[PDB]
Amino acid sequence: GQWDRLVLNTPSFPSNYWDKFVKRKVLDKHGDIFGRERIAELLGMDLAS
Amino acid sequence: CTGNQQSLAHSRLWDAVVGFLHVFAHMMMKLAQDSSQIELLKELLDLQKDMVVMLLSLLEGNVVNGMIARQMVDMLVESSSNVEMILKFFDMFLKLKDIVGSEAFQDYVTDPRGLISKKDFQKAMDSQKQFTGPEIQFLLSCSEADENEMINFEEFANRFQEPARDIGFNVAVLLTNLSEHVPHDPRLRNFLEL
Ligand SMILES: Cn1c(=O)c2c(ncn2C)n(C)c1=O
């Protein structure tokens, strides 16, 4: 659970995984109680928000 | 004392509690919009604890889908508005305990003293989903002020907690229990959801 804190930001995180949208279902969920511009980093999508 | 239990069921008692539920809602709502009369609110909640507990006594020793439990949910159908109001009073002040403390919020508070301002508070609870507009207007009321920017966020949150550590507990027991002795019943379900 640490070697894998490297991919989260990567721009191909959902590579071999069907849902190429995961990064956008977490911004939509934990996106209020936590800054919409704070979870807009540890999930890549930098400025993509 | 089952012989005694039926006497209260066939008695002019329900029209008394439904009236109590009505008056309990407004003063519980009115009193919170002030800082000096807060002392009276504490013993008002104690009356709620000594009122719901007797409803448990009626319900103890009851059979499933019994006749006593039918009037319990039936009386709520007419005395609904009042009930719901109470349940809300709890949620509101239990969701704030979380909000204040959520990283997000602590990003709106910008001051050394340790106090947020009215504008900010509004933006915060509003930036965050839920907390419908009129409720935000109310919350910026039960709050204090001091230069309108000394709403010491902390206290507020952990203020009306202890006083109701119970009440909220003894309505949770009320909704759950009936929700076991009077199983199949839509009316109640709704309440449990709120
Ligand atoms: C898009 N998608 C899915 O939504 C899915 C799946 N397997 C299960 N689900 C739900 N696969 C392989 C998939 O490609």
Side-chain angles (χ1 to χ4, degrees), chain A residues 1-32 34-45 48-49, chain B residues 1-87 89-102 104-106 108-112 114-128 130-148 151-153 155-188 190-194:
Chain A
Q2 315 261 357
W3 176 242
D4 51 16
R5 234 214 242 87
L6 278 84
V7 60
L8 255 25
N9 353 52
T10 222
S12 326
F13 172 41
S15 53
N16 318 354
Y17 182 81
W18 68 91
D19 199 282
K20 9 248 1 131
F21 299 109
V22 30
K23 330 233 257 66
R24 201 213 234 77
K25 281 117 72 37
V26 354
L27 179 102
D28 115 282
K29 213 216 254 227
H30 321 134
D32 45 86
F34 307 127
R36 173 175 226 68
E37 270 38 74
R38 180 138 53 253
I39 70 255
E41 335 268 35
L42 32 102
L43 211 84
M45 47 198 350
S49 250
Chain B
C1 294
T2 48
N4 210 317
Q5 269 162 0
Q6 323 284 340
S7 164
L8 293 169
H10 281 333
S11 172
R12 194 131 71 80
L13 175 63
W14 324 114
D15 63 358
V17 293
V18 59
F20 267 125
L21 271 173
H22 165 278
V23 65
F24 292 163
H26 302 298
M27 321 275 288
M28 163 175 309
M29 182 75 57
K30 204 192 141 53
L31 262 67
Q33 293 184 350
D34 186 74
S35 187
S36 82
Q37 65 183 357
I38 193 66
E39 180 53 36
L40 192 148
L41 178 62
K42 294 181 176 67
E43 51 275 10
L44 188 153
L45 272 299
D46 263 358
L47 180 69
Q48 314 295 280
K49 122 100 113 2
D50 217 346
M51 201 266 278
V52 62
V53 62
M54 72 145 288
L55 294 174
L56 279 295
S57 300
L58 271 75
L59 183 62
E60 66 182 1
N62 176 254
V63 76
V64 63
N65 204 345
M67 211 65 208
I68 301 299
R70 285 184 187 271
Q71 283 144 330
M72 211 55 48
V73 65
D74 186 74
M75 183 278 288
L76 294 180
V77 176
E78 22 112 327
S79 81
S80 224
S81 117
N82 310 145
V83 175
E84 2 264 39
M85 169 139 11
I86 329 206
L87 320 178
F89 176 81
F90 300 116
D91 296 17
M92 231 174 14
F93 286 120
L94 129 157
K95 275 124 45 68
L96 179 90
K97 254 320 246 33
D98 317 344
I99 293 268
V100 175
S102 81
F105 186 79
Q106 343 294 99
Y108 282 109
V109 36
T110 153
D111 143 78
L115 337 169
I116 206 191
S117 102
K118 218 74 79 121
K119 7 266 333 104
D120 326 338
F121 198 85
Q122 158 102 42
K123 314 150 85 33
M125 321 269 142
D126 122 85
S127 86
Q128 321 224 18
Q130 67 267 13
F131 286 168
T132 300
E135 284 55 35
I136 301 299
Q137 293 293 30
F138 168 78
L139 294 174
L140 286 189
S141 99
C142 121
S143 24
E144 282 6 273
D146 338 305
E147 328 126 77
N148 210 74
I151 301 87
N152 178 7
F153 69 141
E155 174 257 4
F156 188 8
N158 35 230
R159 182 197 325 182
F160 337 75
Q161 300 301 126
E162 189 33 63
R165 167 60 167 74
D166 305 70
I167 309 306
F169 185 86
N170 284 76
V171 292
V173 183
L174 178 59
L175 274 296
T176 300
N177 189 357
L178 284 162
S179 181
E180 261 186 42
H181 299 356
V182 50
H184 324 135
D185 189 289
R187 302 111 67 71
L188 199 52
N190 157 55
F191 292 118
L192 274 103
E193 284 121 40
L194 338 158

